[PDB]
Write a protein that binds this ligand. Structure first.
Ligand code: HEM
Ligand SMILES: CCCCCCCCCCCCCCCC(=O)NCC(=O)O
Length: 457
């Protein structure tokens, strides 16, 4: 047994005020650098322990001892995501039921079926950039969000957000971002119901209505449609769980739609933005990735098999996920009393937070050069020790859309690298914006076309 390190306190508020920053994860990473593999974080009537080492996180990932917990951030997101897959407890009937009903939507057969629609949106991104004038630059995260939101909309719901037809935000995105920002900001509130937050509450309810009005539109579009679809929404509306034999009810379907539109694009936009950022900051790595894209993507538009062949692009994405996993943490609770790492006693119900970016910087696993961007670390994924690399979470509660995200991002990054040479024209200083999720803010580049014709579709 050992005393646990803990950061600075603010009297009766304990550690709570440390979350009074617009960059909490980054603040927690700095605390982990100072305190080590584990530290306690107290708030009035609440406590959790932040883990940063693979040695302790591998134990936390033992599902016989710990189950997914809804962190305070997820409890706030649940106000609009309900018992959708991301914010449901493992023991709630609707978690396994929806998991069984929707898993087929991420099968290899399904991925092959989404490919053409991913190409449709990727072609729109490449055409936008080909059409820019000499003077112009690209707002990277903004365009990656256009791409990822449209891709989940089309592949998952046969709905076109038509984001490339807009210069300003879709009300959905504005409301989604503001809702996630509010959840993050509520983390530091000692008195959530003080009147000074009435405006925040009013705005939060307004943003939730906007998201629900969009769900209404997607559902109306499907009912009134003639096109026969067999996508995510088809399974949500018609699929039956093999175990219970039951389909989802209307309320849960609405929560899944909101969940998938948000989880199904926000983090992929972050991944693509960080990958491009690292590529322009590491010229030799960008050269290797571009060479592979040119060599592999020999047709007017990429085939599904060709995307699977973009090995180095895939390594680039994994190395971007290592340094800046866009869902930066996940939470666990102890199923029963147990001892963590042979020295930290936990009582049944105690919470743990896995700080993924810190796990990914564990020098005892990766070597000392953890801050370097080296895709080659992922040349042979099998040599990576179990539970050392966890950008998609753990076990039965791991990311259900992992393959969708990586196929979309590999396809798009491959096409980007094939069609343009990129320039960090402002020598951009990394600024990571936090809204629970992480993404570069203000990242801009110039893309000079290689003038390679694009195929139809
Ligand atoms: C590279 C982009 C992505 C990253 C880094 C990511 C990361 C994660 C992580 C860390 C979790 C576990 C959360 C926890 O334990 O609290 C998770 C869960 C989940 N993700 Fe992803 N994700 C990504 C893309 C996607 C996409 C594109 C979709 C939709 C197709 C998606 C849908 C989900 C859902 C529905 C869950 C909840 C699964 C369950 O518990 O049943 N994710 N993701
Ligand atoms: C409905 C799908 C929603 C997808 C959004 C995913 C975001 C999940 C982010 C995980 C939490 C980020 C951590 C924020 C900082 C922190 O340590 N908070 C402590 C806490 O929330 O208890």
């Amino acid at each position: 047994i050992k005393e646990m390190p803990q950061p600075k306190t603010f009297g009766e508020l304990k550690n709570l005020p440390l979350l009074n920053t617009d960059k909490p994860v980054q603040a927690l990473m700095k605390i982990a650098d100072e305190l080590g593999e584990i530290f306690k974080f107290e708030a009035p009537g609440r406590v959790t322990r932040y883990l940063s080492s693979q040695r302790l996180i591998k134990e936390a990932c033992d599902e016989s001892r710990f189950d997914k917990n809804l962190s305070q951030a997820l409890k706030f997101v649940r106000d609009f995501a309900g018992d959708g897959l991301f914010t449901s407890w493992t023991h709630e009937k609707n978690w396994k039921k929806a998991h069984n009903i929707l898993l087929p939507s991420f099968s290899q057969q399904a991925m092959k079926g989404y490919h053409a629609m991913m190409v449709d949106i990727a072609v729109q991104l490449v055409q936008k950039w080909e059409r820019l004038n000499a003077d112009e630059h690209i707002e990277v995260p903004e365009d990656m969000t256009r791409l990822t939101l449209d891709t989940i909309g089309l592949c998952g719901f046969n709905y076109r957000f038509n984001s490339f037809y807009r210069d300003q935000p879709h009300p959905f995105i504005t409301s989604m971002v503001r809702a996630l920002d509010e959840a993050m900001n509520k983390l530091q509130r000692a008195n959530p119901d003080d009147p000074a937050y009435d405006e925040n509450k009013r705005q939060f309810q307004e943003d939730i209505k906007v998201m629900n009005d969009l769900v209404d539109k997607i559902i109306a579009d499907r009912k009134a449609s003639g096109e026969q679809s067999d996508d995510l929404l088809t399974h949500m509306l018609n699929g039956k769980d093999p175990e219970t034999g039951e389909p989802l009810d209307d309320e849960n379907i609405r929560y899944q739609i909101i969940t998938f539109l948000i989880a199904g694009h926000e983090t992929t936009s972050g991944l693509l933005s960080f990958a491009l950022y690292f590529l322009v900051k590491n010229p030799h790595v960008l050269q290797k990735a571009a060479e592979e894209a040119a060599r592999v993507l020999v047709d007017p538009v990429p085939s599904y098999k060709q995307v699977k062949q973009l090995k180095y692009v895939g390594m680039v994405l994994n190395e971007a996920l290592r340094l800046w996993p866009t869902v930066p943490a996940f939470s666990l609770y102890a199923k029963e009393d147990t001892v963590l790492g042979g020295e930290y006693p936990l009582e049944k119900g105690d919470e743990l937070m896995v700080l993924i970016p810190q796990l990914h910087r564990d020098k005892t696993i990766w070597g000392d050069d953890v801050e370097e961007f080296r895709p080659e670390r992922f040349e042979n994924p099998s040599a990576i020790p179990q539970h050392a690399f966890k950008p998609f979470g753990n076990g039965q509660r791991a990311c259900i859309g992992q393959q969708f995200a990586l196929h979309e991002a590999t396809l798009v990054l491959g096409m980007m690298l094939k069609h343009f040479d990129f320039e960090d024209h402002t020598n951009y200083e990394l600024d990571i914006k936090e809204t629970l999720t992480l993404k570069p803010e203000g990242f801009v580049v110039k893309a000079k076309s290689k003038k390679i014709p694009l195929g139809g579709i």
